[PDB]
Every structure is written in C-alpha cells, then in structure tokens.
Amino acid sequence: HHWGYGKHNGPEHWHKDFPIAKGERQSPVDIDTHTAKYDPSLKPLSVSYDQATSLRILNNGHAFNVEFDDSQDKAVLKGGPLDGTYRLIQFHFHWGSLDGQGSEHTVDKKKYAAELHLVHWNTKYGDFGKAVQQPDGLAVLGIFLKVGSAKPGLQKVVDVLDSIKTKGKSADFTNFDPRGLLPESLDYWTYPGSLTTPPLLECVTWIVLKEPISVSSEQVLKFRKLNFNGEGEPEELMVDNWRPAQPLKNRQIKASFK
C-alpha cells in the first residue's frame, strides 16, 4: 500500500496511518472572502528570491519538486504574519484532470485549475527536519493558477517534465528563478494550518495570494502527462493530486487588504 490520491488510498483514507488528518488545524481550507477580516497588525510581506539557487527537479510520485539550496540565507520569505526568517526549500504544484479543479485551497468554494506551493522553513530551528516539530516551523506561499495566457516563467519547468515522467526520476535544474511565477499583487489571506499531504503536520503558517497567475492550456496539459507510477509500471497519469478543503474549526482567516 501507500497513501496516494486513488479510490483506495486517497485523502479519505489518510487518517488511518496519519490520525492528525482529522486534527484541529488541517489544510487546505475554503477561503470565505466575506468572513475573512482585514488585519492591520500584519506587516508588509517580503519575498526576496533574487539570490535563489535551484538545484534539481524531482518526481516523487505525488507531484514534482523544484528543490533549492537552503544551506545559506538566500531565497527568503518574511514580514506579513511571520516572525523571523523563513527559507525557501522547494516548490511544487497540485493540479486537476480538468481545468475546473486542481487547487487545494478554494475561494468562496471556487476551485482553480492548479495551485503552486513555495515551501519555506523557519531559520531559527536550524533546518527543515527540526522545523516540522514546531507550531510555527513552516510557511507556505500558495498561488492559484487559472488557464488563460501562458506564464513565460513557467516554461522552463514544463519543458523538463519529459525527463522526470515517472516516480523516482530527477534531473538537474539549476538557475531557475521563482520570481517568474509570482503575480503582480502580493495581497493575501493567512491562517494557521498544516502540510496538505502526509505526514500532514500542523506546523504551517499559510499565506495564500489573492491574485492568481495565468498559465496556458498547453502548459497545464503537460503537467497532466506526468505519472504517479514508476518506470515500467502501468501508466497512472499524475492528475488530481489535491486534497479537498478541511474543517476550519477554531480558526480565523485574516486578509492583508481592504
């Protein structure tokens, strides 16, 4: 066995191996724009990716991760609801089999075609492994993707996917600039949550941007050519690798705007 997104190992099954799946601060969640409240206590959000150093791209059987060198303070996220410095370690996406679904977070129940997750760990914990043992160990910047005009900055990623079609495959991926995946506005919603895939640890401060980026149908279609399976195994297209919205419970989503 092994958790996945299928009928017999999907999200509704995760709680068995990972009881925290029914926890008090699970992600993703639906973002009710009318209930979210503007928070003046939020400081300006700062995304500094100018010195970002990508190293490799990997198909881990659930999605593909563009990994970065986080041995030094380069690509960092700070400000907003965050206290201290968070360092970028990797980014990945969640997408659907159709344009009408694919995102994990939803806005007023609306599902986007995909969602980009830029993962960062709190530098005061030394490293990622230690950060995931803390309630404020991680910060994930989420960006929605809608199908429309192509996103130039994403093409380098889509063009390397052919080399990592199956689970376990990786490829060198240096000099990729994540700044090319950001929308114009940094307006966002924020709330305390968790990792959206096992181990589903509740160590994440979520920062979801309001403005989605546009990607072309051609670009997302290539995402859908990836495989969940390993080389030589029966083909199971990597699509719908998203977890649905979870109970908000005792939480309040704050807005950085209006």
Ligand X SMILES: CCOc1ccc2nc(S(N)(=O)=O)sc2c1
Q: Give the residue numbers of the binding site for substrate.
A: 196-197
Give me the DSSP letters along 94-120. Answer: EE-SSTT---SSEETTBPPSEEEEEEE
Closest residue to Cl ion, judged by C-beta, is 6
Q: What are phi and psi of 191, to 5 degrees?
A: -160, 160
What residues have CB less than 8 Å from 141, skipping those under 6 apart?
47, 77, 117, 118, 120, 207, 208, 209
**Strand bridging mode 138-147 / 204-209:** parallel
8 is catalytic: no
Q: CB of 235: closest distance to Cl ion in angstroms?
A: 11
Binding at 119: pick from ligand X, Cl ion, Zn ion, none (beta carbon under 5-8 Å per type): ligand X
Which of 154, 195, 209, 239 lies at the binding interface for ligand X (CB under 6 A)? 195
Q: What are phi and psi of 158, to 5 degrees?
A: -65, -35
Is residue 117 near ligand X by the rule CB under 6 A? yes
Closest residue to ligand X, judged by C-beta, is 195
Footprint on residues 48-87 left by ligand X (CB under 6 A): none
Is residue 105 near Zn ion by the rule CB under 5 A? no
Catalytic pick among 8, 15, 62, 120: 62
Binding site for ligand X (CB under 6 A): 117, 119, 140, 195-197
> Catalytic residues, which ones?
62
